[PDB]
Design a protein around this ligand. Structure first.
Ligand SMILES: [Ca+2]
Ligand SMILES: [Ca+2]
Ligand SMILES: [Ca+2]
Lengths: 534, 534, 534
């Protein structure tokens, strides 16, 4: 069988792969999207399904007010002593001389279970990872941040013993490794294999310069020798490769005695007839997860097929297990549980923000704050996972002020989004309008040419057609006949590469929202949500 | 004798003056500074003292993660039916096409008591104010925000009945007034006096273009006719006047049948030999509160002495009552209660952040997040209230990493501050260092020329000398002999006028903090805090 | 009758008014536009006509390569000893800590005669002016530039005797006046009237803060006393006045013993429902010339009708004399003299750039450099002189590459313009296209939708309709039926107030050009040029 990369499409960065007997799991980072930490499962490493988000209660994860691309950075998922261990990081400051954050540990018998109250770790840097050694000792490793303005911020990798008995870090923390001249040394994981401790790190930063390198030591404290052939993984030198930004990896040893390496990538939109070294590309699907096969040479791991990483990869010798889709293309909102592929921003949804119970067969969003708010938005959304797809919904809404709007939205962060809305105007009553924000530049391109909605229309149908480099919205008053709204958007503008600011770590979403600035919590009822990839 | 403006110095904007029998109060806005809403008291309108901050627990005010210059905007303090009524606004979004915010009402029989849990009002704009009519009815007025990108955002003034019985706004909301051509129409207050309802509004924005205008109507919902002589109050046309930005006013009728108008102002640093129309000034003391005498002509109020506002103002006919200072110039941290002049950022202090109990005679700050964090800083500060002063402290601190730092800080917001710190270096051990941020540009100007601290020094004394246009830090190991540190700072860079971004609404502070990025909560012990104006 | 301001419409700044017996003249600045210095004539001060541009040969004026808004700044025209004297300034550096410039004197018996080769003066500042005293002595006054970065650049007014006999400045130069606290002291002119030397200066800068102030002395050297009522002229304090930016004035004493004051102004486009103090306006007609009546009070001049400047002004007691228009609404290019309302950029036109002698009834432009070049553009243009007008042309052109284009253009400077062009495309052949530049942001909004021109079309008609806040281009293949190009432009973007950079001193023009990058000098024949105001 063949692995066809990427294995986890759309926004799914920083893969932490972990084996539990013959089950395989990957944890990916979720940043401001709630509930936190995606966990996907596989039997064969080829086919994956989404199965859990452990961080689903305020006591585990409180991101109210968190900056864009703050919150959950690279997660670390392990399996030891018969249970799963999750190290996660809440990032509070995403730019400037500091990166204030807090690391925590939680555990659970199963990935989809009720995770334990969190244990407080440290905050010396992000990318915390829990290593379970073969002598029963446990160690936390993370990057150590140097805020000093005349120094590179990535001071190296710190190691400190973790005591499960005391439920805290113990002993002295030590810097064990400083990285290579590529720098941005982060993503540490340790593996004790045969004669060595192997320290895997990401380097170069999570852009086109991304890489993974491996160092080794006979003792856990180092010093570590660097692979003479470093990096292990990178496509920096090959701008034509389908998989770019190859780094932030983690290693798995299969029950079939084979070796695979999960890592993030970006897949740029077509760059066209433009300088291939200069214009490396825009990635609206964010950072995704791929897996490479590893072979060993002179006691160093090496990527089969070359450092750049390959698209089609020989799968492990395991019977094929494909999964049915975890969502319906047309979700009629007939269940009381919101589909696992939907997230909301920063905080748990409550019945005062969203309800599937108020009116059977509908999702009712009670209007809250605007698309620019980092507090409470009545907004659920799912990832773009293809460059070509249709998404649609229909909504009943009776706004009586321009302070009320409900609609379909393509969204990256609070200053990068577009939306088609049902809202209201003094002279025309209920109308369809377009609103967008392009790195904090706001526009309403239709101006007075909004589209009036007849009083007798109950559900207004709204659709977006995403077609690689561009996308466009349409509406329908009968669910059959659609009309195009003349605002065409560039997909590249909902990409990690385009958005401004220190945090550019998520990806494009498509979703539905209800805004009510007045405080009246006006309800909008959505009859369905469609997502269909082409 | 005479009132000498400003009556409330340093950061004290948006004055809401309120009479209760023969006591007078002014509430001012506090934004991200906690506890919220400053209330000062006076018998005579001449002498004022700081007495309360009602919003002092999370159930009233939850500002964790709030943007700079979000949180508490203009407050509204009234006295009716034997108790005080405070309307306040928590602003969550301070820039862009929306200004997401939430208005609330709380009451108390005394300004310094335990205020009631907040009643939820609306969010259609800020500057909410509660008007008690003489027929038992009550109304809320506030600005109505228009987010549409092709429109000015200030749509006018909205009115809605408030029901004390039902604990909520009732009936329909109505736009009662659209303002003049100066626009930015906000700060609405209604006064029913004789035959008229008078509607006061601030206009022009809280910059050098600030003003106040009065309109009147026979009925509460208008139409309102505008004073032919508008504005009531403004120094926009007079760049040389000592008081600038004159606006956002409230009216009081004294028990001596006299009329006074509290309003905000800015007092620029000397502009020097520079064009007086172009460089209107930098105000490191933020917006302060002044009060003018009012006289009535043809049933319109008029500012005695001219629209620009005067520094010296005839006092009401009340026996003078002066107040003891509300702080000591040298605070020895000898009491279990932190001085009323100190605030912290956003959230309640807890014993895990700051303690006066852990080591009596010291304030112990347990290190938390950096100076750039909008979450939890172990940082207490007080307002600059003069252009010339000294402030100093001494600190006992044993950092073992550059991730730990404690010191004296002059601070405006998370991207505008400077500090002298006890911290640590690999080669020199404990050292004194300088850090600063100038509109998100960071620097550490001493570079390798940090100042080693001898192992035997227990408390390191730190001082800032503020001298109008500039300020500079010094240190001492003995408390007697000071050494200047060669980094000279510009006071104008800690001013409303200098700082970048949509929220520029506080003012300069000086205080003491402790940072510990590691997560070890390393304690710094501060023996005293001095503040002495020259 | 009444004078109706402005008397000189469109780009006509810095008026230097001059009486010669019973003729009145006003010179205005022309910056990079050639030939230099516009001179208008009048018998009555009510009716004006454009009659001369003295600086019409390279020996007088060499601006090849000059920065936008460099070249000819405020001119100074006087009449004395039977002839005209013109002081002019060629500014080579328009931004930064210096304003490198050179002042010159030329003379002529008539304004439309052949002016003498220039006498080199000084360079210590711009705004040079020649004062002829009644004792036969003559003096140059100009502003004196201070480049020091910590100082305001406007050091005051320098005075130095000029010797007609020696053809140079003689003796020592002296600073005679430092200006008021408004600063930007420039535009000095001295008038010896009765017992005083009156020194008039512009202050505040040529923005909405512009003004004129008068000071006086019994001796030419000062000290000068400043008018207690200063300024003499300004509308800074009155944002609603029709005439804004009132300053940079000159005084005339008529032969009827009356006093008038020529000055520049800006007339902003409608600002709409926007804060009147904040958005003072965009002026696409640049800075225009107005005239006020002067009365004397206590030996100080005073502006009749108030300092702000009036639109309607009592005329002097002189018979009214009206002038024929100086252009045909439809210019058929039948004369071999290019119409006086046409200028070109920087350099004299030669028969290799533009010729009326190549084909009778056509203006042939031989393609040169792009719209972005400060060197050689084959481009002639006339001022926008109303907010509402049609301009059009028809062009015969056979481009065979996208490197060749000819058409109609609205133009402010090299990085602010738009144009409709006849050009060429690989797939479609000859095409109509649109190109624009918006503060150095370039766009071609039609993209691949360039408009094919049929092979048999010999003249392509091109037109712009300017309609206050917007304008739009159209074309016709038969001169009868017109098609609109779907692109709408904002008139405010061709305004002094919108353009970036240190020099913002001209105004919008409309004209015709031919570009040929290949070096083939391909000819474009223009059959007519229409300009009709409405
Ligand atoms: Ca349904
Ligand atoms: Ca003490
Ligand atoms: Ca012709």
């Amino acid at each position: 069988s063949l692995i066809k990369n990427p294995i986890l499409r759309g926004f799914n960065p920083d893969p932490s792969i972990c084996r539990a007997d013959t089950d395989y799991y990957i944890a990916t980072s979720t940043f401001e999207w709630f509930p936190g930490v995606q966990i996907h499962h596989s039997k064969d490493l080829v086919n994956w399904h989404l199965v859990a988000h452990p961080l689903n209660r305020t006591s585990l994860l409180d991101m109210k007010g968190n900056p864009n691309s703050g919150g959950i950075w690279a997660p670390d998922l392990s399996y030891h002593d018969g249970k799963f261990w999750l190290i996660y990081t809440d990032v509070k400051v995403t730019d400037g001389m500091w990166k204030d954050c807090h690391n925590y540990l939680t555990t659970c018998e199963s990935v989809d279970g009720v995770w334990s109250d969190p244990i407080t770790l440290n905050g010396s840097g992000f990318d915390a990872s829990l290593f379970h050694d073969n002598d029963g000792k446990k160690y936390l490793v993370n990057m150590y941040w140097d805020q000093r303005t005349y120094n590179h911020n990535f001071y190296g990798i710190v190691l400190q013993e973790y005591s499960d008995k005391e439920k805290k870090l113990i002993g002295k923390a030590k810097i064990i490794y400083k990285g290579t001249d590529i720098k941005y040394t982060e993503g540490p994981h340790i593996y004790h294999i045969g004669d060595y401790y192997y320290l895997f790190t990401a380097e170069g930063g999570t852009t086109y310069e991304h890489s993974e390198t491996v160092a080794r030591s006979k003792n856990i404290d180092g010093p570590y020798e660097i692979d003479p052939e470093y990096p292990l993984l990178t496509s920096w030198h090959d701008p034509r490769n389908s998989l770019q930004k190859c780094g932030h990896a983690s290693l798995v040893h299969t029950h079939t005695d084979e070796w695979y390496l999960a890592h993030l990538v970006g897949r740029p939109l077509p760059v066209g007839n433009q300088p291939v070294l200069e214009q490396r590309g825009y990635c609206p699907l964010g950072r995704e997860t791929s897996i490479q096969r590893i072979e060993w040479v002179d006691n160093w791991p090496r990527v089969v097929g070359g450092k750049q990483g390959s698209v089609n990869v020989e799968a492990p010798k395991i019977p094929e297990v494909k999964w049915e889709k975890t969502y319906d293309e047309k979700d009629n909102f007939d269940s009381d549980k919101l589909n696992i592929n939907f997230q909301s921003l920063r905080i748990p949804l409550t019945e005062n923000i969203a309800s599937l119970k108020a009116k059977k067969g509908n999702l009712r969003l009670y209007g809250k704050e605007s698309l620019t708010s980092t507090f409470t938005q009545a907004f659920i959304a799912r990832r773009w996972q293809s460059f070509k797809f249709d998404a649609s919904t229909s909504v009943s809404f009776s706004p009586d002020t321009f302070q009320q709007a409900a609609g379909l939205t393509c969204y990256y962060n609070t200053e990068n989004w577009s939306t088609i809305q049902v809202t209201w105007n003094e002279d025309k009553g209920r109308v369809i309008d377009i609103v967008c924000c392009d790195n904090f530049h706001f526009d309403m391109p239709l101006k007075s040419n909004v589209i009036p909605i007849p009083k007798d229309v109950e559900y207004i149908h709204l659709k977006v057609e995403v077609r690689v480099e561009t996308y466009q919205y349409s509406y329908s008053f009968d669910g059959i006949n659609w009309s195009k709204v003349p605002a065409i958007f560039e997909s590249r503008k909902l990409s990690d590469d385009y958005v401004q600011g220190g945090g550019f770590f998520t990806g494009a979403f498509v979703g539905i929202n209800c805004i009510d600035i007045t405080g009246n919590n006006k309800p909008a009822d959505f009859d369905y949500f469609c997502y269909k990839e082409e």
